[PDB]
């Protein structure tokens, strides 16, 4: 629908939708921008990510409420299936954008890592509702692992995209892959390597890094 709007206007409107907490609009605007065919800037990648994370986040939270009602106990099943189908469509939409053609056109390591992390995240969301499920778990693991390999070669241990990747990969291992010791080992080594690197950072970079490290520590606390 957004094909007749200028790229710059779509980006501006995505920023306004964020301020208005209109995340479905935000995602539609950023989808439009992606489909203009130009690579995305760092700020634009973040806008894309924030929009769809909030949309799918609301769907996941709804799905969990309905699934828990369903299990205690046709309407509940029927309405969970409806929400589940909507969530799968959103994930398919994101993965479609990544595959046509954000990833292949991502020359830089930081762009390619960002998009591969997203691919893992949206397969992860698909895995949460899947039962085939095995194929989806493997697709998530492979995307995450390819992002890790690039990130370890090309980015420092405190880089916020590398840290956010390692955080989410560790959650995958713990929540999806039934590999809690893998999750704990990844979070711990990620945390220690970033810690030993904080001395190189400005006050701004320091704030970025220690914010995500706190999430890693929180999970290690819940997991052990």
């Amino acid at each position: 629908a957004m094909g007749s709007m200028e790229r710059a206007s779509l980006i501006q409107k995505a920023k306004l939708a964020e301020q208005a907490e209109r995340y479905e609009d935000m995602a539609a605007f950023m989808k439009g921008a992606v489909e203009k065919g130009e690579e995305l800037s760092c700020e634009e990648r973040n806008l894309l990510s924030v929009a769809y994370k909030n949309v799918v986040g609301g769907q996941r939270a709804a799905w969990r409420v309905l699934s828990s009602i369903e299990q205690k106990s046709p309407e509940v099943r029927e309405y969970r299936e409806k929400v589940e189908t909507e969530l799968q469509g959103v994930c398919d939409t994101v993965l479609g954008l990544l595959d046509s053609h954000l990833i292949k056109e991502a020359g830089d390591a930081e762009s390619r890592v960002f998009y591969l992390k997203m691919k893992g995240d949206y397969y992860r969301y698909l895995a949460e509702v899947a039962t085939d499920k095995k194929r989806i778990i493997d697709s998530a693991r492979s995307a995450y692992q390819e992002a890790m390999d690039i990130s370890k070669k090309e980015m420092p241990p405190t880089n916020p995209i590398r840290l956010g990747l390692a955080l989410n990969f560790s959650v995958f291992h713990y929540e999806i892959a039934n590999s809690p010791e893998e999750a704990i080992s990844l979070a711990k080594t990620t945390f220690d390597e970033a810690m030993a690197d904080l001395h190189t950072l400005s006050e701004d970079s320091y704030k970025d890094s220690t914010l995500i490290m706190q999430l890693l520590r929180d999970n290690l606390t819940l997991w052990t």
Binding site: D121, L167, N168, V171, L215
Partner: peptide
């Protein structure tokens, strides 16, 4: 478990 916010 908490993921990247």
């Amino acid at each position: 478990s908490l993921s990247e916010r």
